[PDB]
Amino acid sequence: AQYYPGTTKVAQNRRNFCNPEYELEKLREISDEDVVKILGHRAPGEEYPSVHPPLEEMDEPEDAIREMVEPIDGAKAGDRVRYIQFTDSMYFAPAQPYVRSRAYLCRYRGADAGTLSGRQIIETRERDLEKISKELLETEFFDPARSGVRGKSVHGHSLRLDEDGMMFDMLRRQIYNKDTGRVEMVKNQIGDELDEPVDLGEPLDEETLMEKTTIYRVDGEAYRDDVEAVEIMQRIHVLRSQGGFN
Amino acid sequence: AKFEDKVDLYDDRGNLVEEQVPLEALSPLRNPAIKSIVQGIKRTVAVNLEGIENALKTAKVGGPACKIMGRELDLDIVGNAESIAAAAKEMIQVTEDDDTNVELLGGGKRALVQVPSARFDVAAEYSAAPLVTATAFVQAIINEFDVSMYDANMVKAAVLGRYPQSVEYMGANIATMLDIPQKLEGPGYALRNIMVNHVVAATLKNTLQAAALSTILEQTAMFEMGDAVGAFERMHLLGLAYQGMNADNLVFDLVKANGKEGTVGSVIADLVERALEDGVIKVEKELTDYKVYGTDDLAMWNAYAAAGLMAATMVNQGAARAAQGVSSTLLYYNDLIEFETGLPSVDFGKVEGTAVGFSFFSHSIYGGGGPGIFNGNHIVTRHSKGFAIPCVAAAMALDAGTQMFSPEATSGLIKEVFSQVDEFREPLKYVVEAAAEIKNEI
Amino acid sequence: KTAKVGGPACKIMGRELDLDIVGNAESIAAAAKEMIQVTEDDDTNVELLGGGKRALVQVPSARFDVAAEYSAAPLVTATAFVQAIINEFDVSMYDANMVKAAVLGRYPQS
Amino acid sequence: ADKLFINALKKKFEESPEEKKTTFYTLGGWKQSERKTEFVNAGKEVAAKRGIPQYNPDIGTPLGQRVLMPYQVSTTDTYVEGDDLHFVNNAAMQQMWDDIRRTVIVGLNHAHAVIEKRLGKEVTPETITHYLETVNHAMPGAAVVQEHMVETHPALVADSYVKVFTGNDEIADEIDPAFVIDINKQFPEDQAETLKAEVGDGIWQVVRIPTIVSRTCDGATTSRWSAMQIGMSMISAYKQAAGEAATGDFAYAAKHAEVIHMGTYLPVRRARGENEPGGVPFGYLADICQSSRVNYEDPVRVSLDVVATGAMLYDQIWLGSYMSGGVGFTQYATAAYTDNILDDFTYFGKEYVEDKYGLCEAPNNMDTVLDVATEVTFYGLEQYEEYPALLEDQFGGSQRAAVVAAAAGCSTAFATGNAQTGLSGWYLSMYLHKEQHSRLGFYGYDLQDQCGASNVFSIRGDEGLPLELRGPNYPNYAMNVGHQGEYAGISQAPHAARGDAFVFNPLVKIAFADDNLVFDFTNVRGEFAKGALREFEPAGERALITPA
Amino acid sequence: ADKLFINALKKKFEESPEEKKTTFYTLGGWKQSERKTEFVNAGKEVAAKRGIPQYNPDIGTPLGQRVLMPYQVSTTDTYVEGDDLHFVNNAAMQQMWDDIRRTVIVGLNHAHAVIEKRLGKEVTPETITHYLETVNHAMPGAAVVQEHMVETHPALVADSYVKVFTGNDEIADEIDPAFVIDINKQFPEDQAETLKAEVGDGIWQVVRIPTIVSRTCDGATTSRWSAMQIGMSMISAYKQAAGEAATGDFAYAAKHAEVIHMGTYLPVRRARGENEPGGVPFGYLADICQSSRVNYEDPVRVSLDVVATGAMLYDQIWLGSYMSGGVGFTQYATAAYTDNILDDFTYFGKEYVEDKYGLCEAPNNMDTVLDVATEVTFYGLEQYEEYPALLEDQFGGSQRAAVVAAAAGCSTAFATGNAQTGLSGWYLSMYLHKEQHSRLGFYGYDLQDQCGASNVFSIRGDEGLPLELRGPNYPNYAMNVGHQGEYAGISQAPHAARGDAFVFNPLVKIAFADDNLVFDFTNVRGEFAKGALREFEPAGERALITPA
Ligand code: F43
Ligand SMILES: C[C@@H](OP(=O)(O)O)[C@H](NC(=O)CCCCCCS)C(=O)O
Ligand SMILES: O=S(=O)(O)CCS
Ligand SMILES: O=S(=O)(O)CCS
Ligand SMILES: [Mg+2]
Ligand SMILES: [Mg+2]
Ligand SMILES: [Mg+2]
Ligand SMILES: [Mg+2]
Ligand SMILES: [Mg+2]
Ligand SMILES: [Mg+2]
Ligand SMILES: [Mg+2]
Ligand SMILES: [Zn+2]
């Protein structure tokens, strides 16, 4: 698959996020327990709550489509559908909103992804969401200064960075420490205090942000100079226009 | 034949039924089974005799929480169902050997009613079904028990609700898959105002059959709206065949190849490869490490992409066994395929746009709800001309129990009555048989 | 010709199109009838009146035996005339929406 | 004792009310009237200010060649010129309508189930009370989740809030009484028992959106406004993601699956959305009026307070403005709520029935209709023949038709305990009155009247309905003055004689049992008088945001 | 000269508009804001008086962790917090909608034909003036025929009147000029000749009913109230029997055959009658705005005055209240009429088109759409990238999408002189924006956007319509913020570049050229600022009839 046109670093980075054969760079280690705490849906050692009984207990009629489609493990179990949501700064965060939903539907099974300017979300079965979430948090989908895990109060994608280089967060879920240079997650994604903070590693420096970003900007690679990517957008416009007419 | 296209037709197990069927043998305008399905859905009513009896015994008539103290009437309607139904049938039929059907279900608690087709051939629309059924059962219940002139208006309220003070039959104990003509968003929309959950309930959650019934209703509405007249006719017929009738086993084979480990993106890659292999698209231009595809048949590219979209919904919401992500599949299948190819997505962007608002109105405070409460007449989901809602039907067929407003919650009366009807329950079977039958008349 | 479309007293300056529809009524009618009909020689009737100023149109009864109601008559008729007008004069993509407005009015805003 | 209208007649005219002759033409036209003089002076000032002629007493015919009468608001000792009862000039009447229009009842039963099942979270009195603090900040138009929101001025929207009620006393008694319509406090014991049994363990919100918004917008705004802020307060108080798939079930429940509108939408010739007057069924209007829970020892007073509520809303604001306009229909309505005239006639009929049958003990049949409705019709008509001042007071035949037939229909229902034979007695009254005086109402008054007998007991599609379910959109009723509010009275009459807590919807009855409303629904006729005197304080004004 | 938004950005933030970094969390939350401090104090006062908690700044999340910004009303020097632009808090915004809702245009052509042919009486300027004196007494709610009528207080209904206009100068000048909208006085010469040619010898009334009635009732009241008082005034002024068969022809003419509503009624899911915002097509909204007749030298100013008119009405009042409610959509709309941002982008695009093509000289084709909309899209987007203060100001992607695409679509229509290619340029703008920043608007913003390209030039039943005829009920547009007012600007843009007197209906254009309106439609943004400062005086208030 081709994924995206263009000849910039931005374009290649958009293709690499979509391509399940591209190995996302891992930047930080986070424990399973700490992913669970950051998600905030259940407590450590709490069994997965259910929304319906396990599939095997349900005795369904013959359906060739269902027989061909393997359910994700949380669907077999009857897990709740829960979410993880991220906000990406327009100051060169590595992932961005449509990059995420496009990538998620190429990489992940059984996924309900939503894109907005200030937040991007995936909803899926809870035990499967915890496995995807580890990857979204540990890899270059995430930077702990320019990306935020935020289930509510998401303002900041379009705000000026603070003096530490951190995105604004009304609820200050991610704190940079002036003396040490690491970010810690001090609250879960909905804003409740964590018993103990989670280290999220060092913010990527400017050079590495520029290497890895998927936003086009005049002070990075401008979209209007990625003339092949603009050509395909314009093509789509014109072909949809003619096809709606006749 | 106006069109030279032929398609191979399969059953819902992926076995070939008939090869090389002319496209127009699937047209709503020609296929006798689609005619019988559509006249069936015009003429079929579910009567809840238990619900009428209970509303009368408690005087709970006229809509939610409403009650008239002092108006209670205790009538043994379910215990006299056979007689009541026969007397209603005598008023419903036109003649004694016509196609009127009145059949008790549930030990007399429910009745399937099919009002004779001929009442509709001399009617403007379809409201004769609930209105002739309602009065025949109100009169039959009054005559069974000799209900007095002073009390009979309670029987009317228990059967048809607060109408005509309300525009709808508010509080009625009858139900139809269609809704009243005043609720159409535009003229020609009546076959679109059919809840997704009613389609999934009538077809017993068989995914292919739900997708077929939904497609047949949506694309038949496209004819009634004039959308499938002239320039656009072939586009609509090919969407019906490939997205809703599993033509050439395309949907089926995509799901088979992607069901075990697949994603929306893997289904896209397979569909693009199949379109290329079949000659539906070709490389037009090379950019820098990027092939720009073109087509000399936009209706067929649209159809192939539509089959892929249905497969992607089956793979994606089938793997989750949770319908909610159909709004995301409908969006990003189309958004990804345009940047994958350089060609326009299904319905030239209108599935993608329907999916943007459907996603918003299924995950926000402003309106909408869960997938099963939408329909082709809903303001959020009317915009694509038949290519979105059948995927929602497939997704709700595959939902394992994540919805509060599930077909069990919203459509139980519909399910008991309308799934009795073979052509509603298994339309893929009947439409393909009828197409094979008229194969040489096109 | 006047751009007076969309309801009483309405006009869009600059949108006028001067098309000789009544002088070419026979061709336009025939092209509409081919889209209106289900099969050749079915019960579709398209007959000109008043030297091409008016047309009586009877949409084939079969389209109604597969419809819920009766709106296919104006909807199928309007679209077949809009497309036959556009095809008769080769009206451009940019201008064709005025043909639509002159046939069917302010629908679907109204 | 004097008939109940004698005091008013004696206030109106110099002559005693039995006197047959008078003098006309000597009062100086409009100059006899304080209010008309106010209007002439205001007209001159308006026309100068704006540079366009406006009110002018010399255009058209000269008002006041007879006495321009004061009216007693029935059950009060307030006497006002009829212009002070016009809804434009009476802020109590406008607020009555705003308080109905801006109310919606919205269940929490689906919502709490979504919380317990999809989200896997608990619901308790504690979490409900948290939710109610949250929604009472959010409902008037204030923010709970996003940064940089701009909000409504709290003092402009001080009339908007959310309360709850439930038949479960355990939960009801535990919530801050600030948020609870307490059934046990608001209703006498019998009625509270009935209402709590209807509601059961259901929990329902009564949402009032701001009057200033209902005036700027329309009735169909109410349930949407309510649902947006319920939705925000569910997200904030229960810690959902701020917009996830489950958020849509709260929206569908609050907008459709557990909403009770005050009015349903209308057909296109009279196109209107929800919560407009034409959509309010007569049974609901009787339940909105709160006389039943205060005056329950006197079924006549309950029934006629319902008639006043409905005559004003349905004739003055609905038919006289929404469906027409101009000078409109003040006195078509005031005949039913002034001078104690309907009260005289209806207490006669109640007396008649109580002595002959006992309330609610007459057979529910045509015999009872023929007896009671004829007897009460001849009593009311005899009063106009014996008191010439009463006939000159209710000068239009429509007025008299509505009044006499309201008394006849209500009395019939007090006998039978059933509104449908009450309605048959209304129509028979009209047919007897038409033959007695060789006139009835205005040119179109008896469209419904002549269809009436045959449609009382019909069962056909657009004909058959119990009276309580009928309303201003019942086909025969959709046009004409002098019927709708009286039918709401007939709908109330058998339930008031039976002692029923409600007529048609117990949720609607409870939802108006609330002293935080701006209008006092327990004393509709007292409020109309207060508005007529310019002493009622409505919500919704813009003085805070306009210059001094 | 500096970009037009620079002064606003320097007023809002201490840093220079180019500065990439700031400080947050140090402003005391809500305590930084005069308006939030007023709201916190008012909420304490409201809650204590009524005994129910209300506004509380500690509910949910703490506003003002960042700067709570002032906004400059574009084209003014007034800077206010955004709460002062919420429609609930802005009496000018409420009156703008009241003045549209309460207006209807009603011909006298069929009426005068009924008089001449059916009654056999002559019509002349003199009989027209006498009818106008009569209807200006009756329209606000006063009587002309019957005895014992009770009437509206003239000072409560001072804003209601009737004027007329005609394209025949000699007939206009013979009718009393107090009643005449004088086309030649109100319009510059070329536009006046166009409008008079459209009207010809036709004679039309502009009828405005009282704001207090419109707020009590709904928009569908307006043509009814109009017709009632036209009917009474035709009876009184032309000496009919007061109710004869010919009376019904004046009713049908005024209510149906020669009425022009501002808005058509809506389908049942969003049921509303006539004269509600969703029925107002975009070409009518551009015609209601009167910037065209004052600022005709500057097509950018005209177009962006129409954008302000529409963003307020369609997003704040219609989508943000009638169709939702709560805190609502103030800043979704303010992005299009504050800080001179859309003005900076749109002047850029107008000058680009002037230099490359000449206004209205570009070919009307897709080449032009691709050139102009792409160039203007990139300019707008570069401003957010160059100025971090501008991005933090228009912080929501939907606000940016609407502002950038309005400048792109208006500029494309300035090039082609045709609104349809302007609309194609709007959609291309959204597609480029989405790919540039990997975001666009809110979850549901681009439903119409993705259907958009294919439906611009479609001719199918519910798809194909010239942009001027579309409106908030065009199917794809029926839900979402950030489009409808911008589409009214694009509908105005080619007509302002061409110097056309109107966009879609010349009668609507004339009908608002009237300084007797309460809102000044020639200076919509000036009025919004006046209302924000609490300096606008609305009609409709109840002060005269309530306690001092
Ligand atoms: C709960 C929702 C989901 C939903 O259905 N509507 C919400 C909330 C709702 C509430 C917020 C009021 C409150 O805080 O209590 C109101 C005001 C509607 C109402 N009920 O009155 C609203 N949004 Ni929202 N909403 C807005 C916007 C947005 C932007 C904000 C992005 C940012 O970075 O700040 C995003 C969508 C996006 O990402 O593109 C958004 C999301 C959301 N919007 C998320 C909450 C986001 C969060 O958790 O912070 N709105 C805007 O982009 C600007 C205009 C703004 C609206 C208020 C106004 O117009 O003044 C408000 C319009
Ligand atoms: C979708 C529909 O809601 P329902 O699905 O019918 O509840 C509709 N609301 C809306 O369109 C909301 C529009 C304004 C709020 C969102 C603006 S993006 C309505 O209430 O009629
Ligand atoms: O005279 S009419 O009966 O037509 C109207 C009475 S208000
Ligand atoms: O977050 S959402 O896009 O659903 C709502 C924006 S106001
Ligand atoms: Mg590890
Ligand atoms: Mg190569
Ligand atoms: Mg306590
Ligand atoms: Mg009180
Ligand atoms: Mg009081
Ligand atoms: Mg350049
Ligand atoms: Mg002025
Ligand atoms: Zn109003």
PDB file of N, CA and C in Angstrom, chain E residues 469-510:
ATOM      1  N   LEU E 469     -30.276  29.938  -3.277  1.00  0.00           N
ATOM      2  CA  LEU E 469     -31.552  29.312  -2.897  1.00  0.00           C
ATOM      3  C   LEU E 469     -31.301  28.338  -1.733  1.00  0.00           C
ATOM      4  N   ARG E 470     -30.110  27.885  -1.487  1.00  0.00           N
ATOM      5  CA  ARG E 470     -29.896  27.003  -0.309  1.00  0.00           C
ATOM      6  C   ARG E 470     -30.082  27.806   0.964  1.00  0.00           C
ATOM      7  N   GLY E 471     -30.126  27.095   2.051  1.00  0.00           N
ATOM      8  CA  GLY E 471     -30.321  27.679   3.404  1.00  0.00           C
ATOM      9  C   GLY E 471     -30.091  26.619   4.427  1.00  0.00           C
ATOM     10  N   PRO E 472     -30.463  26.908   5.663  1.00  0.00           N
ATOM     11  CA  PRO E 472     -30.217  25.962   6.778  1.00  0.00           C
ATOM     12  C   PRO E 472     -31.008  24.653   6.674  1.00  0.00           C
ATOM     13  N   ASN E 473     -31.940  24.550   5.764  1.00  0.00           N
ATOM     14  CA  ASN E 473     -32.677  23.309   5.540  1.00  0.00           C
ATOM     15  C   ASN E 473     -32.189  22.559   4.342  1.00  0.00           C
ATOM     16  N   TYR E 474     -31.201  23.072   3.617  1.00  0.00           N
ATOM     17  CA  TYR E 474     -30.583  22.235   2.577  1.00  0.00           C
ATOM     18  C   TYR E 474     -30.017  20.997   3.299  1.00  0.00           C
ATOM     19  N   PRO E 475     -30.258  19.786   2.835  1.00  0.00           N
ATOM     20  CA  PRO E 475     -30.084  18.609   3.733  1.00  0.00           C
ATOM     21  C   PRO E 475     -28.728  18.551   4.361  1.00  0.00           C
ATOM     22  N   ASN E 476     -27.647  18.721   3.586  1.00  0.00           N
ATOM     23  CA  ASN E 476     -26.316  18.567   4.104  1.00  0.00           C
ATOM     24  C   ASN E 476     -25.981  19.694   5.137  1.00  0.00           C
ATOM     25  N   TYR E 477     -26.749  20.791   5.119  1.00  0.00           N
ATOM     26  CA  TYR E 477     -26.369  21.930   5.959  1.00  0.00           C
ATOM     27  C   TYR E 477     -27.211  21.975   7.221  1.00  0.00           C
ATOM     28  N   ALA E 478     -28.099  20.997   7.438  1.00  0.00           N
ATOM     29  CA  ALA E 478     -29.184  21.222   8.432  1.00  0.00           C
ATOM     30  C   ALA E 478     -28.680  21.139   9.850  1.00  0.00           C
ATOM     31  N   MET E 479     -27.465  20.720  10.131  1.00  0.00           N
ATOM     32  CA  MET E 479     -26.994  20.476  11.523  1.00  0.00           C
ATOM     33  C   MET E 479     -25.909  21.392  12.004  1.00  0.00           C
ATOM     34  N   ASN E 480     -24.926  21.766  11.183  1.00  0.00           N
ATOM     35  CA  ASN E 480     -23.639  22.094  11.809  1.00  0.00           C
ATOM     36  C   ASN E 480     -23.221  23.551  11.817  1.00  0.00           C
ATOM     37  N   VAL E 481     -22.548  23.951  12.892  1.00  0.00           N
ATOM     38  CA  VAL E 481     -22.059  25.308  13.038  1.00  0.00           C
ATOM     39  C   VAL E 481     -20.941  25.594  12.045  1.00  0.00           C
ATOM     40  N   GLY E 482     -20.606  26.883  11.942  1.00  0.00           N
ATOM     41  CA  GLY E 482     -19.417  27.251  11.154  1.00  0.00           C
ATOM     42  C   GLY E 482     -19.568  27.148   9.657  1.00  0.00           C
ATOM     43  N   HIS E 483     -20.819  27.185   9.129  1.00  0.00           N
ATOM     44  CA  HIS E 483     -21.038  27.157   7.679  1.00  0.00           C
ATOM     45  C   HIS E 483     -22.054  28.124   7.203  1.00  0.00           C
ATOM     46  N   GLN E 484     -23.220  28.189   7.863  1.00  0.00           N
ATOM     47  CA  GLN E 484     -24.420  28.881   7.230  1.00  0.00           C
ATOM     48  C   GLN E 484     -24.191  30.348   7.070  1.00  0.00           C
ATOM     49  N   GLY E 485     -23.689  31.077   8.063  1.00  0.00           N
ATOM     50  CA  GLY E 485     -23.501  32.516   7.878  1.00  0.00           C
ATOM     51  C   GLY E 485     -22.394  32.786   6.808  1.00  0.00           C
ATOM     52  N   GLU E 486     -21.380  31.924   6.764  1.00  0.00           N
ATOM     53  CA  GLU E 486     -20.327  32.055   5.773  1.00  0.00           C
ATOM     54  C   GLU E 486     -20.941  31.821   4.386  1.00  0.00           C
ATOM     55  N   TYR E 487     -21.835  30.846   4.202  1.00  0.00           N
ATOM     56  CA  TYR E 487     -22.473  30.673   2.927  1.00  0.00           C
ATOM     57  C   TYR E 487     -23.280  31.908   2.560  1.00  0.00           C
ATOM     58  N   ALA E 488     -23.956  32.573   3.486  1.00  0.00           N
ATOM     59  CA  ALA E 488     -24.672  33.810   3.117  1.00  0.00           C
ATOM     60  C   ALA E 488     -23.634  34.835   2.622  1.00  0.00           C
ATOM     61  N   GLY E 489     -22.492  34.935   3.267  1.00  0.00           N
ATOM     62  CA  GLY E 489     -21.416  35.813   2.697  1.00  0.00           C
ATOM     63  C   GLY E 489     -20.988  35.383   1.314  1.00  0.00           C
ATOM     64  N   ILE E 490     -20.779  34.136   1.044  1.00  0.00           N
ATOM     65  CA  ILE E 490     -20.400  33.759  -0.318  1.00  0.00           C
ATOM     66  C   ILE E 490     -21.524  34.068  -1.275  1.00  0.00           C
ATOM     67  N   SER E 491     -22.804  33.916  -0.870  1.00  0.00           N
ATOM     68  CA  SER E 491     -23.896  34.268  -1.781  1.00  0.00           C
ATOM     69  C   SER E 491     -23.827  35.778  -2.038  1.00  0.00           C
ATOM     70  N   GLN E 492     -23.519  36.610  -1.061  1.00  0.00           N
ATOM     71  CA  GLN E 492     -23.392  38.054  -1.322  1.00  0.00           C
ATOM     72  C   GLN E 492     -22.188  38.380  -2.172  1.00  0.00           C
ATOM     73  N   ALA E 493     -21.076  37.736  -2.038  1.00  0.00           N
ATOM     74  CA  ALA E 493     -19.770  38.135  -2.629  1.00  0.00           C
ATOM     75  C   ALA E 493     -19.874  38.428  -4.141  1.00  0.00           C
ATOM     76  N   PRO E 494     -20.352  37.573  -4.984  1.00  0.00           N
ATOM     77  CA  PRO E 494     -20.285  37.903  -6.448  1.00  0.00           C
ATOM     78  C   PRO E 494     -21.211  39.016  -6.727  1.00  0.00           C
ATOM     79  N   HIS E 495     -22.339  39.143  -6.070  1.00  0.00           N
ATOM     80  CA  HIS E 495     -23.272  40.219  -6.277  1.00  0.00           C
ATOM     81  C   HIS E 495     -22.673  41.538  -5.806  1.00  0.00           C
ATOM     82  N   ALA E 496     -21.949  41.586  -4.698  1.00  0.00           N
ATOM     83  CA  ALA E 496     -21.294  42.856  -4.291  1.00  0.00           C
ATOM     84  C   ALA E 496     -20.219  43.147  -5.327  1.00  0.00           C
ATOM     85  N   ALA E 497     -19.447  42.214  -5.793  1.00  0.00           N
ATOM     86  CA  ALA E 497     -18.348  42.505  -6.788  1.00  0.00           C
ATOM     87  C   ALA E 497     -19.030  43.023  -8.049  1.00  0.00           C
ATOM     88  N   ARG E 498     -20.173  42.508  -8.485  1.00  0.00           N
ATOM     89  CA  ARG E 498     -20.856  42.926  -9.722  1.00  0.00           C
ATOM     90  C   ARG E 498     -21.551  44.263  -9.515  1.00  0.00           C
ATOM     91  N   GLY E 499     -21.794  44.708  -8.317  1.00  0.00           N
ATOM     92  CA  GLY E 499     -22.603  45.918  -8.016  1.00  0.00           C
ATOM     93  C   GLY E 499     -24.102  45.647  -8.137  1.00  0.00           C
ATOM     94  N   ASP E 500     -24.548  44.394  -8.061  1.00  0.00           N
ATOM     95  CA  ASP E 500     -26.005  44.071  -8.070  1.00  0.00           C
ATOM     96  C   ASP E 500     -26.743  44.636  -6.811  1.00  0.00           C
ATOM     97  N   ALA E 501     -27.900  45.169  -6.952  1.00  0.00           N
ATOM     98  CA  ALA E 501     -28.633  45.725  -5.856  1.00  0.00           C
ATOM     99  C   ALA E 501     -29.101  44.625  -4.872  1.00  0.00           C
ATOM    100  N   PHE E 502     -29.206  43.386  -5.332  1.00  0.00           N
ATOM    101  CA  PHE E 502     -29.764  42.297  -4.441  1.00  0.00           C
ATOM    102  C   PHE E 502     -29.175  41.037  -4.933  1.00  0.00           C
ATOM    103  N   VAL E 503     -29.295  40.049  -4.037  1.00  0.00           N
ATOM    104  CA  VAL E 503     -28.737  38.673  -4.237  1.00  0.00           C
ATOM    105  C   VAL E 503     -29.794  37.681  -4.705  1.00  0.00           C
ATOM    106  N   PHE E 504     -31.025  37.773  -4.167  1.00  0.00           N
ATOM    107  CA  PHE E 504     -32.032  36.741  -4.513  1.00  0.00           C
ATOM    108  C   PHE E 504     -33.453  37.233  -4.488  1.00  0.00           C
ATOM    109  N   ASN E 505     -33.797  38.301  -3.747  1.00  0.00           N
ATOM    110  CA  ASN E 505     -35.152  38.770  -3.769  1.00  0.00           C
ATOM    111  C   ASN E 505     -35.144  40.277  -3.553  1.00  0.00           C
ATOM    112  N   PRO E 506     -35.521  41.034  -4.592  1.00  0.00           N
ATOM    113  CA  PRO E 506     -35.504  42.532  -4.497  1.00  0.00           C
ATOM    114  C   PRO E 506     -36.524  43.048  -3.535  1.00  0.00           C
ATOM    115  N   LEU E 507     -37.640  42.359  -3.285  1.00  0.00           N
ATOM    116  CA  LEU E 507     -38.608  42.809  -2.338  1.00  0.00           C
ATOM    117  C   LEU E 507     -38.042  42.732  -0.921  1.00  0.00           C
ATOM    118  N   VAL E 508     -37.322  41.629  -0.621  1.00  0.00           N
ATOM    119  CA  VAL E 508     -36.679  41.524   0.705  1.00  0.00           C
ATOM    120  C   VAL E 508     -35.650  42.602   0.863  1.00  0.00           C
ATOM    121  N   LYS E 509     -34.850  42.875  -0.141  1.00  0.00           N
ATOM    122  CA  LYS E 509     -33.866  43.968  -0.016  1.00  0.00           C
ATOM    123  C   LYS E 509     -34.516  45.271   0.329  1.00  0.00           C
ATOM    124  N   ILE E 510     -35.546  45.668  -0.406  1.00  0.00           N
ATOM    125  CA  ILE E 510     -36.246  46.918  -0.063  1.00  0.00           C
ATOM    126  C   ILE E 510     -36.893  46.926   1.289  1.00  0.00           C
TER     127      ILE E 510
END
